[PDB]
Amino acid sequence: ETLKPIFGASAERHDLPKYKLAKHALEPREADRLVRDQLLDEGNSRLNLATFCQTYMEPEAVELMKDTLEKNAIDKSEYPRTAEIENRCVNIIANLWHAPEAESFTGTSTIGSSEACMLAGLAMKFAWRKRAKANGLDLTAHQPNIVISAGYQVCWEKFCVYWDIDMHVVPMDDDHMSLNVDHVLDYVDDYTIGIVGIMGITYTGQYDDLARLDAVVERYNRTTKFPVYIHVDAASGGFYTPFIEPELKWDFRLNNVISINASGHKYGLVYPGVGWVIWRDQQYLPKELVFKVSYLGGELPTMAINFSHSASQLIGQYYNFIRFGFDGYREIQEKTHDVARYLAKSLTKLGGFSLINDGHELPLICYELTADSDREWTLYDLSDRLLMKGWQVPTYPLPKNMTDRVIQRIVVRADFGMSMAHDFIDDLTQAIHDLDQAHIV
Amino acid sequence: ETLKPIFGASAERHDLPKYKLAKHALEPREADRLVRDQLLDEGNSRLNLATFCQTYMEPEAVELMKDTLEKNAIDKSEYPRTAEIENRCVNIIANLWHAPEAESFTGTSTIGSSEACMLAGLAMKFAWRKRAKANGLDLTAHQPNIVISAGYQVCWEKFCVYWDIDMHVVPMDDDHMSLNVDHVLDYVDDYTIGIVGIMGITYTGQYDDLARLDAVVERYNRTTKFPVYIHVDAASGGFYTPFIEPELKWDFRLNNVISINASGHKYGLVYPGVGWVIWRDQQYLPKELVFKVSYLGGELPTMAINFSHSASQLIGQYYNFIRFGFDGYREIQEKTHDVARYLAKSLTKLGGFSLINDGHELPLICYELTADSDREWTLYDLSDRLLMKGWQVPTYPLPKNMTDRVIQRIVVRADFGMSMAHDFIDDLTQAIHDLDQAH
Amino acid sequence: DLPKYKLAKHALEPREADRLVRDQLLDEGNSRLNLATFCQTYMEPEAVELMKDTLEKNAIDKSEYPRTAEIENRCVNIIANLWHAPEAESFTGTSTIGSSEACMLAGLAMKFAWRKRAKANGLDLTAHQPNIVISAGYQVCWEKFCVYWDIDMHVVPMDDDHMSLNVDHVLDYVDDYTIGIVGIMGITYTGQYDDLARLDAVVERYNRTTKFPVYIHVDAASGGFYTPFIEPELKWDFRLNNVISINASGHKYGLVYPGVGWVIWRDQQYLPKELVFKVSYLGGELPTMAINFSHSASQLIGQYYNFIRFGFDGYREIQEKTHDVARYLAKSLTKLGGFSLINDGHELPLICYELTADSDREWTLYDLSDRLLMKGWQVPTYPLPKNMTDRVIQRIVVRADFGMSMAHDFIDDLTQAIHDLDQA
Ligand SMILES: *Cc1c(COP(=O)(O)O)cnc(C)c1O
Ligand SMILES: *Cc1c(COP(=O)(O)O)cnc(C)c1O
Ligand SMILES: *Cc1c(COP(=O)(O)O)cnc(C)c1O
């Protein structure tokens, strides 16, 4: 049985189970080799330039994550030490976002910013509904709505479809590639549950002007009995911007920012599987959304869509916090910023590229092809050629009012080093040369 | 700085950050030691008997999970091999649950059964809503409802709160530690989006009689233009019952079971982080819950609440499928069954216990203390002593119409060996003795 | 950046140096998805760890590693017997780095043996160089042998009816100056076997009528560790009387990572004594034939590991599996249509093909290589050897670690690439 060579065994002579469980078990070495082999031919994650999600952690953190895979992040009474870590993380992030000590912030780890955005939105919906009932607003006339920029990530569309919320979408244009705050009051009405500000737009790399939105909202709220507050989607900005622009006011320093989310597995430096949501004060969380759990043979409040899941990633987040601290994070984000700027400068130096975003805010570059009548090929062709050399660079359309603009994004993470970025620009230069003399589509 | 002994260094003279980041970085070996040390003082997971969640996997699966932590399960176009493995697990699981060849099943991995239950309940709500509109029901008069046993896991209560559904709860009693199928139609009306049958109840370890419920539903549905269908919450049973009672009809063999969820991290044998939901046919999934993702420069359908997350657990699930196959899963679940039955027999031989559930169905044992005015201690005191001897055994009240009944539960998972269970019973014997003479 | 011209002045941290080298290595192909080479891209975990643990051993150093030397001699014995070295005669052999060095050493034995014959017969050595006769699908090492040692290459061209040595005409290239004929048991470009049994009979007839006889060297770089396990009845080896020496690459179908080959002589008389350098091991002195001096013993020890671990049945199971994958691929390409198979994997597990004539097809095999590379597979395009240099082919070489599940994935990738190309 183990006498069989791994690549002489019966299982290596047949296809893998695709529709049903095979009758018999296999040796651990055989199953292992077959599963790993199915995975060989997908992009090496380090060359995936299409994602915010982290593709490197230090070996110590990898080993640590491995050793805590059995831990169950929901089970506070059985894993009270993991639950303490989570609490420390929430405190740490709250302080990073200037949660005021005069109010009692609450928050939680989530699987990612999607779960967090949905919880935040649900908190807004439920708080809005109590206001609406008390002011005799007719709940059958219209659906509640939220106001958000057209750069929204798909989780906000899921939130709206799943919970019967209209989306009041503030479109982008050539000058407003972030929320047009000057016009935001045109989308607000009695049924508005809140306004989402995006601190790092997935499509463009740009910050919404949260400080200006906060000023407008402060003034709007004196004029109505249907006040409206800000949720910040800082999926990506939340772990980046405090270390490189600490004086930019986007967070709980703004009076009307009531909740904030971020993904640990974006610029929090953790592999996929953790996000974070924080409410400035226990009142911006309606009690009917809080399910209470056993802890210290007593009680703790929880806001959660998921139940059981791995604590590995939240532990990893604490490992990062302790390991890097403020200065370590800052050094990492600064080098990331620097590679993004080298890249934006390299693409203008090559010509044929017009930069939509040059990496001044998030470390992300967006560009389109400058129109040239003597070019058969599109960015789709460029993405194909770059795959030949390992690189994944996605091509996509901009969101509404710029759906005629086709772009490519490069997102730069902590493990995209300066040397690898010089290599990328070589590979990219050769691709442009190869496509300039191509004879097929 | 790298010369310092780990326990001679400045970071071990100071407390860890609790309220804010420290300013300065630490060396990797020091950070690693400090985080692991914070974790020493929780109960070794293998001795946690309150939970269905897996606390062991074989070393080859551990290493494969480690090696795949950077993969992002949502990102199909960048990890198409991982997405193909996912599709293969949906097929495998659909087949295991007898999805009919004549219809076209769909499904997806989830983080767990919570997200699965919620996506199923939402499919039911949206499909109910179209049917209700088309029959002119007044949608303003009552919230939609769902019907379920009182032993529902908290994720159904969350589903109901979050989506404004009324829960019509069928109570338990002394003779019905699972759904009272004969009474279920008292709870159904035109507003009912569906009935949830639980294939392995968290509190009691018992199967809802899904076959009987299907026959009740089939009869009810011929008399009405508001038909009702069954969603099976098989969080636990989905990966247990197919291997030990393959003939028990609970799954898509029943005509009116339109969807089923199971937790891969329960009897599917994966560490926490993977669940599964399957629909018997595409028509039971409303198109407006499907958000589309690029793949091979085309389009692929997804139902999902979460977005980015680890692929490690789902690859682990496929590893288990390949490594164990049907017979391996069967041998594991059989051993697990054997241990549960050993624990049930040892509690009865000790005297002083009444078995509420004896582990014939899920491998779970439920018990209360028999009436006795001379005994001054409670099951809460027993939990506390068992904890001193290393074990976590929860004490809790039974659900509706038994909320005055206090019980203990022991769940038996794959990694509770017979050896270890003999040791548990010695420990339980000693703790009883200790409680009988303390104050 | 990393040093590209000069040494840096200062050392780096281990983790930093490690990270920098490994990152530089990132962006080259996962080796296992390269279908253009015979070189092994996988070994079992015990072998990898044994290799790592004997990295320090020196294969050349016999008095200092006598147990490693014994292992070499065992492998030589094992390989001799596999290729049916006769017991009536006295075979010798050695490990080498690869088939190149082995080919070179065998070619040099032939040159030196020819030159003595030639002097004895009064042949004018100044009038022509010695020559060797070989098929036009020769591997580059034969051309380096000829250039390095001043031997003319008498090349037998290939054509549509002969994708291996043309035995009908091989003697047209043979003359008094011929040091030998090389028969290739697995041609790199085409995967085909030269008809060794026929060449042997032809040579036996030739040799009966001249005092300048010619013998056969078999370049079994690939076939040597493959053909004995799936076609043991095929006579290609020392069962043929005029086969005097044979080479094979252990890092080809011998299943070892790069860095071992083997050369065996059927008898001591085919190895001129001037090529033998003797050494100090155990009580006496051991004969050596070797171009290289110090080098790793890891691959050698890897080969013995493989022989002990798998034995006959294990090698056979691996090679039969490999055979089945190759056959699966040939049948999958015929199912798709549009390909003309030059080799269909009945001989070596290599499939070789061209696109069938079609005027309404805008794309070529070069474009197909490109789309496969996008999908992660290296399947390059190249011209055939002399007389078919205008014919453009693609090749898939199947090795031990190309399992059947992986091959179904490859075929789905290939199917999709074709579709994409037909809309381009
Ligand atoms: C990616 C992203 C999300 C979703 O994040 P996950 O962590 O993948 O769930 C939400 N908002 C924004 C701005 C994002 O970039
Ligand atoms: C635990 C459980 C759930 C929740 O499962 P997770 O996988 O933890 O989300 C749902 N239903 C039942 C019956 C359960 O036992
Ligand atoms: C590759 C090859 C060689 C050279 O082999 P190495 O082991 O790389 O030195 C010689 N002959 C044939 C037939 C080959 O395929």
PDB file of C-alpha atoms and ligand atoms in Angstrom, chain A residues 52 112-115 117 153 155-156 198 200 202 233 235-236 261 263 265-266, chain B residues 307-308, ligand 1:
ATOM      1  CA  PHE A  52      -5.521  44.580  -1.519  1.00  0.00           C
ATOM      2  CA  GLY A 112     -13.712  41.077   6.759  1.00  0.00           C
ATOM      3  CA  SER A 113     -15.024  44.517   5.959  1.00  0.00           C
ATOM      4  CA  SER A 114     -18.102  43.018   4.267  1.00  0.00           C
ATOM      5  CA  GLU A 115     -19.507  41.588   7.469  1.00  0.00           C
ATOM      6  CA  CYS A 117     -20.151  47.116   6.709  1.00  0.00           C
ATOM      7  CA  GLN A 153     -17.443  48.041  -3.113  1.00  0.00           C
ATOM      8  CA  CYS A 155     -20.667  44.616  -0.134  1.00  0.00           C
ATOM      9  CA  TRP A 156     -22.768  47.843  -0.009  1.00  0.00           C
ATOM     10  CA  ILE A 198     -15.089  55.669   1.767  1.00  0.00           C
ATOM     11  CA  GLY A 200      -9.801  54.498   0.166  1.00  0.00           C
ATOM     12  CA  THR A 202     -11.323  50.321  -4.263  1.00  0.00           C
ATOM     13  CA  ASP A 233     -15.652  52.347   5.022  1.00  0.00           C
ATOM     14  CA  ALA A 235     -11.492  48.764   4.406  1.00  0.00           C
ATOM     15  CA  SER A 236      -8.127  49.815   3.040  1.00  0.00           C
ATOM     16  CA  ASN A 261     -14.639  49.398   9.492  1.00  0.00           C
ATOM     17  CA  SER A 263      -9.931  44.955   6.784  1.00  0.00           C
ATOM     18  CA  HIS A 265      -6.185  41.556   5.646  1.00  0.00           C
ATOM     19  CA  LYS A 266      -5.813  44.720   3.536  1.00  0.00           C
TER      20      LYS A 266
ATOM     21  CA  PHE B 307     -16.175  38.721   0.682  1.00  0.00           C
ATOM     22  CA  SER B 308     -12.390  38.077   1.196  1.00  0.00           C
TER      23      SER B 308
HETATM   24  C1  LIG D   1     -12.570  45.116  -0.360  1.00  0.00           C
HETATM   25  C2  LIG D   1     -13.405  46.213   0.283  1.00  0.00           C
HETATM   26  C3  LIG D   1     -14.557  45.861   1.040  1.00  0.00           C
HETATM   27  C4  LIG D   1     -14.786  44.383   1.302  1.00  0.00           C
HETATM   28  O1  LIG D   1     -13.688  43.923   2.158  1.00  0.00           O
HETATM   29  P1  LIG D   1     -13.499  42.394   2.654  1.00  0.00           P
HETATM   30  O2  LIG D   1     -12.461  42.658   3.739  1.00  0.00           O
HETATM   31  O3  LIG D   1     -12.969  41.664   1.491  1.00  0.00           O
HETATM   32  O4  LIG D   1     -14.835  41.846   3.073  1.00  0.00           O
HETATM   33  C5  LIG D   1     -15.377  46.897   1.545  1.00  0.00           C
HETATM   34  N1  LIG D   1     -15.096  48.178   1.306  1.00  0.00           N
HETATM   35  C6  LIG D   1     -14.034  48.603   0.584  1.00  0.00           C
HETATM   36  C7  LIG D   1     -13.701  50.074   0.362  1.00  0.00           C
HETATM   37  C8  LIG D   1     -13.094  47.627   0.046  1.00  0.00           C
HETATM   38  O5  LIG D   1     -11.947  47.993  -0.659  1.00  0.00           O
END
